């Protein structure tokens, strides 16, 4: 396929909640969960509530979601995080960004949920629902530590 699970993902430039420039590089010591919405999307805000408790469980193990929308105006993008409660890493794609952005991703379609490592890999893709949070529980949560005294 054009992207592959282990292939690096291009850099997304998108503006922060202030007005600054903020690349996925900026994270990228972290797993970063790409998510491609709007508030025109219907389903996006459906799996919100997923997203919000997957961010805020494993953002402190190592996770970070980047949340990309790009909606007609920022004003409405600032909106769609206060409808929606989306209390992460939200930025504001800019609008020639978001041509690069989704066409290099193989993306003709929405919405689409990438998980990539701190190498800026994707490392899976496709997560549903709260399976995404259990995805990044599967891996990072445990049975990795070793208990290398007997529990830990």
């Given at each position: 396929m054009s992207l592959a699970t282990g292939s690096v993902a291009p850099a997304i430039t998108g503006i922060d909640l202030k007005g600054n420039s903020v690349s996925l590089?900026?994270?990228?010591?972290?797993?970063?969960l790409v998510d491609f919405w709007f508030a025109g999307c219907s389903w996006c805000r459906k799996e919100t509530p997923y997203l919000l408790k997957t961010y805020n469980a494993f953002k402190?193990?190592?996770?970070?979601?980047?949340?990309?929308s790009t909606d007609r105006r920022e004003?409405?993008?600032?909106?769609?995080?206060?409808?929606?409660?989306?209390?992460?890493?939200?930025?504001l794609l800019?609008?020639?960004?978001?041509?690069?952005?989704?066409?290099?991703?193989?993306?003709?379609?929405?919405?689409?949920?990438?998980?990539?490592?701190?190498?800026?890999?994707?490392?899976?893709?496709?997560?549903?629902?709260?399976?995404?949070?259990n995805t990044v529980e599967k891996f990072v949560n445990g049975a990795k530590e070793g208990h290398h005294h007997h529990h830990h």
């Open positions: 590089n900026d994270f990228k010591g972290k797993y970063v402190d193990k190592g996770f970070t979601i980047y949340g990309v004003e409405d993008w600032k909106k769609a995080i206060e409808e929606d409660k989306s209390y992460w890493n939200q930025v800019q609008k020639d960004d978001v041509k690069d952005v989704l066409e290099s991703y193989c993306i003709v379609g929405f919405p689409h949920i990438i998980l990539v490592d701190p190498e800026g890999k994707i490392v899976a893709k496709e997560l549903r629902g709260d399976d995404l949070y």
